[PDB]
């Protein structure tokens, strides 16, 4: 910047000049306690991984599909329940 | 990356430049005019499309002609 | 011949409260343009990007996201003010490209020693027509 | 300094070779119509002042001589209504019989079979039934005689020749220099006091004088022809203290402070007149000397030729606070040398007073039997809404139009104007998102309203019988105005209107006010009219924001504010001038006024008008807005095609008028729809086709024949999609609440 | 019987339509005093009425199914079962004064077009020419058809304007 | 006298402006010691609490709203539905992680509002948005299973 006076612009400084600031991240070292932080590493080791996080969609895309199998009913809903009589029509059909 | 032309039909009386808001066309010397002036394009990466310099010609038909093609985040005239 | 002038960083800028019409993300990883003009007292001129600023004694520098800005700011200062002004095209990488007043004469004065490129030795009917060109990838203005 | 009355003598020449020649007043429209493009600038051009002349004087002469014409129009147009009422009308006979008698007072001439428009209104009279109101009015004022009507419609035609006669003088004769118009603290210490002050202390003069007897002679139950003249009644204080005895007394109490003894004909009780289901006249005597008086305080504000007072400019320049840098600096100059702003801020006013009275007199009807006529309260209701509107977006378009052409940077440094257009891209983007939380929770309730209902589940869908949505705040204040008397009103008898609660007030068998009850679905209506109402506030301030400059355009201040485009570059610049978000919120209010409109009639139809019969009240519709208004199917069922039926069945009698406008309306809106949706290019080669046919046969005019502009098609477009819809819910309304009732 | 259709004079539902419209105009008569200007204005519109369904009778239209007056828009099929007046003469009329109104425009366009200021002359109108012209105007298929064989009416193509295909 | 709207580290011509709620102490306080905003923990943890505080957010609204609402069973459907809002917005992290960290970009850099350099933070690349993906995934879950839980051992529910 070398803003100093009314100086906005610098070459040599050319990074503060544009606009790009953190506006409010900070550097810091501490925040989460020990162990739990083992823990959740542990409980999301391998699963960094894209095809495995992929992976993770297919059995939520899996269990979608057994909704639909066996899920839907258990709930009850409508659309699988039972039928009660019907009705004829405006003239002679069905 | 709009196609800007010039043509012979161009009297040299620099409207289209000044209507230019980007800085496009300029004037370069020439022989087939009156005015011994044609327009010239150099600069049209910069040109946006808004044919500000067709509405200043008053050749009939038009001498500075723009073609809309390719679109840039200049030719869009993007600020962000 | 003509030099280009070196865009001088330390210059001071015109008074100004912050606007929001300012540098986006553009800036920073694409382009930001930027204007310098000679001004011979202190006086309130419009900004592109909304609101009034105060350029001041002498040398100022403004610096604006698109090359139309400046352009827009420049004209208003050559016809409100009579005022020239450089524009300068500065990458976030550190090179810097001079601009609008490249021959050192205005693009509306001939200069003698230009570029005639764009300029097309017929009429706007002589053009070929658009099947002896077809599967090519132009126009028929570019021929 | 000093405030004084400066003119010039004998300015402009009255003689008529001006009028030989079209297009005068700008120099752009010289040299003859080259194109028809020439002829529609010459009648845009025609008020367009600052494009004429340069000079402020000029224009506020002008302005000041227009100012007089509109007034002679309006006295014309007033005399007209007066004159109507005397010759043409049966309100002698809707005197005697208010209730029954539907008021008339335009016939038509038997000439193509449409004296079937003369409808069987009753008192022996045919005629087409008026909507208007003005047969309440002259009720409240206390006519009740037809000589009346005329004398008051040769003195409004007086009236207009002095109008046409004071511009012709101010323009030609005497016109005022500019320092005559800049004299703003005369000016208002003048319109409030002399104008507003005096003007509510003479009608209240004339309800004390003329007003209160007649009127209680009529509600007592009196034949018009027998009821003394007002002048008898104002002549001798007799008859004044048969019918209030504090007259008796005359205005010894008043100038010696006893005001409490004149308390029966200056009284505030509230409610409504039982008689007539208006409102007491002695309570709005009262309330015109209040104001009267409130007014002429009022108008010893501001400083003129002696040193009491305070300078508008003072009390603007010291109110800056830390947020917001110079305040008002520059605000006193910006609207004492630029009409538009002025313009600006008076339409925006006008147009929002223009909706609060037809809040404040459906609410609650200042005239004797106005509540129990729905035709005349519903036409008035939607009449004055559809003017604020309209007022509402001219004053967006003026605000926009000095912020192209008056605005000047210099002297709008680091100030409230400054400070706006400094963070306009924070105002709108705020506003941006307050439209589309509000699209989302009113409309997409509705939608899901749709869904549940077609779903078979209406216990999903919200509404007051499954998920509740109840105006909790909005009923806790009526609650709070059906308690105030005795309470935070002490001296009130009865609460401002019966929508707040308590009994119904039923005025010959029909119900004049009753209480408005608030569920979901008028939790729904209600913010379905905010997100309208915001929307059109964000088209017009972006227009007004943007109008000077932009990202996209840095230099749209230069391009002017009515321009059609910059070009098809930078991906496409259409509808960039603030000319055009005028346009798009011209639209926008029509869309929000329609709604709030259509939610006004169905739902004073649904629980408010309707029928006593001693053992409850039955409504037009039948209380059906409470299980049909939260389902969009519910408003284009049983509000927009049951209440059609009127309309459309209406050919054959006294509506078929109405029946016809309702297509007519139709058409106009659909050819609105032209303009609208096509581009000039496609009507300017046609055009070229159509002049090779005449040039084919040697009928080519002179005056080459152009497709309109693009702001003029916009324009065209938008004027007949407004006149369209207007027009179709006009006839809609008026057919359905005059066939049934 | 043109077409299937019957004349009104002796059509049944023509005389029922025309029953109707007179017994709802008495159904509106039967509130008023007989002397009153409401019940003038019925009577008058009583007798238009019953008028005007006595000539549609009169003039040998015809009615369909019901009583409602049918047009015929074929010379020879109305000219021979005398019905010209329907579409034929009104044809013959509508083409003489639209001809007349239309040629009184053209020669005014050509009276003002060798003009020193035509621009100024048709937004200014020269009223006794415009006059003069709508009177000479009533003789227009003479003179068009005059004009046509001396081909003064038509222009040559390659005098017109035309775009560059 | 008193000045609280300022630009934004001086230069006037940058689209922020200094306000009392953009820069407040106890706001900027508070919006820096958010966990998105820790550019010097791991991005696992971080987004470890964020899938926590989303799938414990996203409980109610399906236990209320929801169409099994009326039912004693709403909280292990809700659970469920929890569970499928996280898979949906895990595959959302995924797709944007893939396109916009195909590749690098060091340009510039950033500093703070004093005029310090700092790096570019761990998180915007594509092993760093990995991480904050894989911390979203066992979060959300665990979020939305305490949600679960929440509803029987709560006394005022
Ligand atoms: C018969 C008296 C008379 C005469 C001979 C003139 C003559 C003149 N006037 Mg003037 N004027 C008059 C009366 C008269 N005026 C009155 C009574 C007023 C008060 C309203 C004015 C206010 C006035 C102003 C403010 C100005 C003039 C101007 C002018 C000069 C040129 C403009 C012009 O007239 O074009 C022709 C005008 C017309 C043919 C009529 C205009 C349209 C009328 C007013 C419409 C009224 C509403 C009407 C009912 C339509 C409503 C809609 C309808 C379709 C239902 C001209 C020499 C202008 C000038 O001096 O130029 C600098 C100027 O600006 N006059
Ligand atoms: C007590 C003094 C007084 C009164 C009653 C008025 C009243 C009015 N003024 Mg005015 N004005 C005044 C003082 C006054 N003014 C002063 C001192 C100045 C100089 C600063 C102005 C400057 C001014 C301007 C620039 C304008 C007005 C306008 C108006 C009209 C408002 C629009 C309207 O339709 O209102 C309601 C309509 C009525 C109430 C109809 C009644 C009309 C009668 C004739 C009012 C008579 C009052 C008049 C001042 C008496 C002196 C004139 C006399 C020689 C006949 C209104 C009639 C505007 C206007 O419309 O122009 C005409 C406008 O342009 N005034
Ligand atoms: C502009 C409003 C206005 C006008 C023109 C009048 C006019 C009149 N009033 Mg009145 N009055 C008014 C407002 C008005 N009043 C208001 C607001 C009140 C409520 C406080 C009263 C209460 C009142 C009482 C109690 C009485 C009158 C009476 C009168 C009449 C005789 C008094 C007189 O000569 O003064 C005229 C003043 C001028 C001509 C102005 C120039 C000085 C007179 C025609 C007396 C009467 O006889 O009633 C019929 C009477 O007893 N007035
Ligand atoms: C106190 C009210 C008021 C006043 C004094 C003005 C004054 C002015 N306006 Mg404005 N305006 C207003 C209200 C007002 N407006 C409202 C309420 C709106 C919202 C609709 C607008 C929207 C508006 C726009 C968008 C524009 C103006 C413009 C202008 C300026 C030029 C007007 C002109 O000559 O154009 C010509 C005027 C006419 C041609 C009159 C006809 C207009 C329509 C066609 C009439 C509507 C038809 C009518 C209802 C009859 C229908 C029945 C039909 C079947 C016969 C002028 C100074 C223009 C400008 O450039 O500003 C500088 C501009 O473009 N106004
Ligand atoms: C109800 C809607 C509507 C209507 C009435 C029209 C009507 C018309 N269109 Mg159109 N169109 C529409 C919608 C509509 N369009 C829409 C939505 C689009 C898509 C954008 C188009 C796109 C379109 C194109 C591309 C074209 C047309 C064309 C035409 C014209 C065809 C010629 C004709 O049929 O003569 C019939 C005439 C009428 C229907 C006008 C009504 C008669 C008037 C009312 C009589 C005047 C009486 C009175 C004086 C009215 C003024 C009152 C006032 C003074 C108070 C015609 C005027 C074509 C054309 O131009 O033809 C050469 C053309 O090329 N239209
Ligand atoms: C506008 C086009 C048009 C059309 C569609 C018709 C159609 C018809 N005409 Mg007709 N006609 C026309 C123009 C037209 N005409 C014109 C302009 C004239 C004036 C010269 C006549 C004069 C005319 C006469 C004198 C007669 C008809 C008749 C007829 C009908 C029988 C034709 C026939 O026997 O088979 C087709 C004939 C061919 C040569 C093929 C038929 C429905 C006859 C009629 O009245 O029907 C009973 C009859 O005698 N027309
Ligand atoms: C008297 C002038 C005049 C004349 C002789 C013509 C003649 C013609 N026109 Mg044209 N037209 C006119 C005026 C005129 N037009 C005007 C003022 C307009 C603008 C509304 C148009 C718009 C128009 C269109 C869009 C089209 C034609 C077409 C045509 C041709 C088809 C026949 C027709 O009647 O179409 C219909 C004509 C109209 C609908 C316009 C009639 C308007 C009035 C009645 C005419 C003006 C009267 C004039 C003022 C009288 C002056 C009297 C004099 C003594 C001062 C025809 C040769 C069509 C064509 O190209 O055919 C191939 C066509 O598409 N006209
Ligand atoms: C139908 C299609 C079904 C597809 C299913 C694919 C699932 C993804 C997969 O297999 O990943 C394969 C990876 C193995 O990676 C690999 O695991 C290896 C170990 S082994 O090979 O598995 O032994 C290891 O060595 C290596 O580093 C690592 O990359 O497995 C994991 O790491 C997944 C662990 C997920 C743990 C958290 C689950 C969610 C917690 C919910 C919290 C709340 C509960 C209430
Ligand atoms: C409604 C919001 C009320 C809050 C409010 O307006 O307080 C008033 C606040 C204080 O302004 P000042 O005290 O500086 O204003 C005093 C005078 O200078 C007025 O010009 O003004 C603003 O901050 C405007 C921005 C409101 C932002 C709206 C979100
Ligand atoms: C052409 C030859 C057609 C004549 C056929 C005669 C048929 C019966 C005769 C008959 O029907 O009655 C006369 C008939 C029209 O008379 P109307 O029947 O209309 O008379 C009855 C009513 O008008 C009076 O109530 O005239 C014609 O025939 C057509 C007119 C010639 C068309 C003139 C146009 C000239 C160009
Ligand atoms: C139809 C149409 C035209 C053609 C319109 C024309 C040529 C105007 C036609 C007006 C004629 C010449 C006058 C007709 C007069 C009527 C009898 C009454 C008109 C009402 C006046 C009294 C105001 C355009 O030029 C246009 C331009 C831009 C967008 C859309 C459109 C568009 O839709």
Known sequence: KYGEESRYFDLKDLENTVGSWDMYGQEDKSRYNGL???????????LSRREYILGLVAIGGAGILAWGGKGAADVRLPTVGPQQPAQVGPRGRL | ??????????????????????????????????????????????????????????????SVRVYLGSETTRSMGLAY | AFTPPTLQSDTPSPIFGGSTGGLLSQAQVEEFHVITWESKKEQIFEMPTGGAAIMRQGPNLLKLARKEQCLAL?????????????????????????????????????????????????????????????????????? | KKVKIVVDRNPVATNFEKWAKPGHFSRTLSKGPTTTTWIWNLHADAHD??????????????????????????????????????????????????????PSAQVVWPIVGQEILNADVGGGFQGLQITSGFFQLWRAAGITSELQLYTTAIGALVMAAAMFFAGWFHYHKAAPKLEWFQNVESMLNHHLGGLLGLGSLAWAGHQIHVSLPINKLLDAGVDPKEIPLPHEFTLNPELMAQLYPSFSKGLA??????????????????????????????????????????????????????????????????????????????????????????????????????????????????????????????????????????????????????????????????????????????????????????????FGLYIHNDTMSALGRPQDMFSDTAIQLQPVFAQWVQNT????????????????????????????????????????????????????????????????????????????????????CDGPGRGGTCQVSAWDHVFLGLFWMYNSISIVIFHFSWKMQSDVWGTVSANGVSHITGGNFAQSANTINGWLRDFLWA??????????????????????????????????????????????????????????????????????????????????????????????????? | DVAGLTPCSESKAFAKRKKNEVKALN??????????????????????????????????????????????????????????????????????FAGWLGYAGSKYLQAVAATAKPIEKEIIIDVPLAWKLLWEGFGWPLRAFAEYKNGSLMEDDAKITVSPR | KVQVVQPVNGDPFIGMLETPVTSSPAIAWYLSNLPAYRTGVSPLLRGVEIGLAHGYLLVGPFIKLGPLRDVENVAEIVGCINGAATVLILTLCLAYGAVTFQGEGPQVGVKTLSGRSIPRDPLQSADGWNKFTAGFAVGGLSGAAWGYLCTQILPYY
């Open chain 4, 481 to 564: 105005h059906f308690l105030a008397p005795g309470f935070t009103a002490p001296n009130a008898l009865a609460s401002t209107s019966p929508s707040w609660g308590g009994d119904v007030v039923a005025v010959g068998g029909k119900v004049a006010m009753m209480p408005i009850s608030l569920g979901t679905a008028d939790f729904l209506v209600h913010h379905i009219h905010a997100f309208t109402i915001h929307v059109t506030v964000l088209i017009l301030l972006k227009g007004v924001l943007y109008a000077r400059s932009s990202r996209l355009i840095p230099d749209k201040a230069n391009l002017g504010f009515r321009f059609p």
């Open chain 4, 643 to 741: 209440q059609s039926s009127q309309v459309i069945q209406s050919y054959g009698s006294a509506l078929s008028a109405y029946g016809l406008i309702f297509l007519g309306a139709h058409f106009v809106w659909a050819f609105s729809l032209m303009f609208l949706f096509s581009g000039r290019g496609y009507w300017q080669e046609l055009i070229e086709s159509i002049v090779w046919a005449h040039n084919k046969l040697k009928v080519a005019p002179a005056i080459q024949p152009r497709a309109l502009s693009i702001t003029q098609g916009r324009a065209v477009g938008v004027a007949h999609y407004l006149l369209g819809g207007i027009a179709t819910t006009w006839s809609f309304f008026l057919a359905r609440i005059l066939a049934v009732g």
């Open chain 5, 27 to 96: 159904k509106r008569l039967k509130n008023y005093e007989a002397d009153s200007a409401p019940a003038l204005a019925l009577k008058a519109t009583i007798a238009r009425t019953e008028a005007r369904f006595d000539k549609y009778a009169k003039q040998g239209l015809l009615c369909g199914t019901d009583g409602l007056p049918h047009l015929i828009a074929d010379p020879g099929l109305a000219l021979r079962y005398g019905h010209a007046g329907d579409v034929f003469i009104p044809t013959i009329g509508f083409i003489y």
């Open chain 2, 1 to 62: 990356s709009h196609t800007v032309k010039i043509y012979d039909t161009c009297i040299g009386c620099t409207q289209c430049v000044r209507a230019c808001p980007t800085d496009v066309l300029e004037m370069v010397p020439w022989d087939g005019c009156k005015a011994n002036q044609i327009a010239s394009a150099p600069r049209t990466e910069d040109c946006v499309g808004c044919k500000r310099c067709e509405s200043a010609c008053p050749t009939d038909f038009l």
């Open chain 4, 253 to 442: 109490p008043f100038f010696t402070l006893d005001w409490a003894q004149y308390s029966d004909f200056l009284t505030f009780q509230g409610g409504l007149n039982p008689v007539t289901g208006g409102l007491w006249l002695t309570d709005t005597v009262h309330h015109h000397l209040a104001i009267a008086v409130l007014f002429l305080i009022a108008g010893h504000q501001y400083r003129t030729n002696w040193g009491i007072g305070s300078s508008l400019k003072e009390i603007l320049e010291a109110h800056k606070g830390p947020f917001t840098g110079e305040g008002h600096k520059g605000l006193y100059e910006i609207l004492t040398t630029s009409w538009h702003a002025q313009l600006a801020i008076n339409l925006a006013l006008f147009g929002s007073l223009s909706i609060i009275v037809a809040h404040h007199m459906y609410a609650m009807p200042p005239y004797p039997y106005l509540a129990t006529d729905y035709g005349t309260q519903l036409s008035l209701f939607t009449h004055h809404m559809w003017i604020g509107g309209f007022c509402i977006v001219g004053a967006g378009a003026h605000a926009a139009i000095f912020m192209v052409r008056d605005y000047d940077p210099t002297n709008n440094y680091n100030n409230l104007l400054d400070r706006v257009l400094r963070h306009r891209d924070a105002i709108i983007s705020h506003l941006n998102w307050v439209c589309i939380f509000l699209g989302f929770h009113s």
């Open chain 1, 36 to 46: 739990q932080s083992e823990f959740f590493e542990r409980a999301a080791n391998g």
């Open chain 4, 49 to 102: 002042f600052d494009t004429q002349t340069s000079d402020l004087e000029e224009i506020s002469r002008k302005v000041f001589s227009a100012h007089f014409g509109q007034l002679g129009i309006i006295f014309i147009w007033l005399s007209g209504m007066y004159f109507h009422g005397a010759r043409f009308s049966n309100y002698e006979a809707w005197l005697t019989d208010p209730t029954h008698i539907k």
């Open chain 3, 74 to 143: 420049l004209t208003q200062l050559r016809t409100k003010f009579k005022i020239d002004g450089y524009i300068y095209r500065v990458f976030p990488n550190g090179e810097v490209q001079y601009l609008h007043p490249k021959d050192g004469v205005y693009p509306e004065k001939v200069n003698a020693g230009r570029s005639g490129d764009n300029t097309n030795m017929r009429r706007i009917g002589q053009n070929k027509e658009p099947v002896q060109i077809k599967f090519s990838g132009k126009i028929p203005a570019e021929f």
